[PDB]
């Protein structure tokens, strides 16, 4: 199939984009397919059908590491979260 446009936002509790968070995107086997630090913008991804997980390795000071987020992209481009 084709790649589905995923938009990822790391934010504070006030809903503002938060920079300084070291992030990983992993595939269904746990392999890190993307690595980055948040910079205050929405981060774009394009994923083929499969199961993935956003994982935070380090939070900026004054903040707690969020629970990892597992989601699936199906053949019709629909995205289902936990």
């Amino acid at each position: 199939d084709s790649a589905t446009h995923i938009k990822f936002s790391k934010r504070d509790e006030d809903g503002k984009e938060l920079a300084g968070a070291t992030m990983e995107l992993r595939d269904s086997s746990g392999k890190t397919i993307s690595t980055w630090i948040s910079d205050g913008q929405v981060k774009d991804f394009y994923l083929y059908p499969g199961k993935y997980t956003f994982v935070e390795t380090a939070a900026p000071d004054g903040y707690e590491v969020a629970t990892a987020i597992t989601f699936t992209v199906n053949e019709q481009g629909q995205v289902t979260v936990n």
Binding site: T4, H5, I6, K7, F8, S9, K10, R11, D12, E13, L18, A21, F54, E56, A59, P60, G62, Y63, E64, V65, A66, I69, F71, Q78, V79, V81
Partner: peptide, 12 residues
């Protein structure tokens, strides 16, 4: 499709 992850504030 959007995915939103929130960094919670550390305890006060």
């Amino acid at each position: 499709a959007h995915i939103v992850m929130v960094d919670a504030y550390k305890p006060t």
